[PDB]
Design a protein around this ligand. Sequence first.
Ligand SMILES: OC[C@H]1O[C@H](O[C@H]2[C@H](O)[C@@H](O)[C@@H](O[C@H]3[C@H](O)[C@@H](O)[C@@H](O[C@H]4[C@H](O)[C@@H](O)[C@@H](O[C@H]5[C@H](O)[C@@H](O)[C@@H](O)O[C@@H]5CO)O[C@@H]4CO)O[C@@H]3CO)O[C@@H]2CO)[C@H](O)[C@@H](O)[C@@H]1O
Length: 491
Amino acid sequence: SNMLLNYVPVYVMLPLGVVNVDNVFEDPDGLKEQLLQLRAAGVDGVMVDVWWGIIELKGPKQYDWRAYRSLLQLVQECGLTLQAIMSFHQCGGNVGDIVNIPIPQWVLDIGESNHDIFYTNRSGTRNKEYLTVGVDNEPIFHGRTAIEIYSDYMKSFRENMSDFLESGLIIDIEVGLGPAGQLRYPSYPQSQGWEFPGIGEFQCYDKYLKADFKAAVARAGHPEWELPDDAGKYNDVPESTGFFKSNGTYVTEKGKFFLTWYSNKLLNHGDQILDEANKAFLGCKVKLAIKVSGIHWWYKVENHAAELTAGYYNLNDRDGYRPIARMLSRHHAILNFTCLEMRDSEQPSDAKSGPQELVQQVLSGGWREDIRVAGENALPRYDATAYNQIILNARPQGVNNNGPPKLSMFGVTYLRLSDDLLQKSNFNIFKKFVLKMHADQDYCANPQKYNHAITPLKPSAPKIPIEVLLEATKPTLPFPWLPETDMKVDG
Ligand SMILES: OC[C@H]1O[C@H](O[C@H]2[C@H](O)[C@@H](O)[C@@H](O[C@H]3[C@H](O)[C@@H](O)[C@@H](O[C@H]4[C@H](O)[C@@H](O)[C@@H](O[C@H]5[C@H](O)[C@@H](O)[C@@H](O)O[C@@H]5CO)O[C@@H]4CO)O[C@@H]3CO)O[C@@H]2CO)[C@H](O)[C@@H](O)[C@@H]1O
């Protein structure tokens, strides 16, 4: 009884391209066999990208939901729930992307005449994996703004998948908000030569964001201020730049204003799109969620350079994640994080990486703000060390034999279903992982039993002014973490 209240659900990401670029569900029989294995292993559900570039390929509002309806039907038949990602991004240029799925060609056609609809770096390179926040409210897509495109897409999904939603097949809607579906700037593009652990680059040089910034600095009484010109390039280290070096530009009035403006754009981008997601799924028995990327490199140095270029204005004396958690609260949304499997010792010393501390900060911030926090492993891992670290983060203070744990993640999604995962040894270890995540209890079909009942999505609470959101930048002590989990996959 008490142990079941400690149950943390486990989901598994489906293979990329399960539904191909031509909107065809290629191998249902193959997938079926895999899903049945997951079902027998105790997995609660699966996660899948519902690619915008596949669905609305033909043209504006020309949606084809047929292949995905077939996929959802199979998932339901196999007794698994689903986390559906509204993927308004391209698959192909990020780590692990083994299939190329661009955004709609008709959108790219518009991009040919207006290159500024894409995130742009100082050098002028255009990244076509996602539409810049700069055009969120620009009615340049055959009369629609980018946010309207996202809104219409989600509404169409809600209506065309109404039966699956009513039956409870979908656990949550992961609202894609940028590259790799994450609320972030494409500051570390492998497509432009970035290599870990480069500090990355600011991506606010498209004409819309640049004009936005210029107007902002003018209103601040400094019209002459320009975007950073001393931040170096993708593969630099912080000390080699005028912007991130000690006493550098990042701590000057100009630098602080820019960083605040830059990170604020993401806060409002997510807030505005979540407003549309709430409207689209209002009344549905599903929860909303967003994804925040885990930029752990340089976390251990004063400048947190990589986080800053990604859009997370997080420093040792400024919490850049709690404001995101606070923004999510009005939407009753889940903050889906990552790097749950990483240990600092596994990263190269020169990267000044702190994934363990970063995870502790983000999860603690979410709990401090009274919102649900879920997460994923950042990279493919099949070993016990990885699973034990995930289980530790899932319940930082262990299991409570007297009832529910004071601290527990809302769920964990494993990246990713593959042939390797299903191999004898790998899968046997994975089964132990599932068992421990479930607090040694057998798979529990009814989430209500472990206090995960889903009620109709209510309208979002009143808008929270930016000043109140930023009050959450006040540094706070993280919740204490055990050094190791009390539920290891082995002994
Ligand atoms: O289907 C869902 C979704 O899947 C894919 O996106 C997911 C990413 O695959 C996943 O990594 C994560 O996104 C972030 C991640 O959170 C973040 O940490 C970062 O990843 C870093 C590593 O942390 C870092 O260690 C380094 O990895 C090196 C590694 O050190 C080295 O030893 C060797 O293994 O090479 C690795 C590759 O460089 O760099 C990576 C970045 O390259 O960035 C990730 C990407 O933003 O969560 C994503 C969302 O689920 C698909 O890409 C996406 O389209 C799908 O929607």
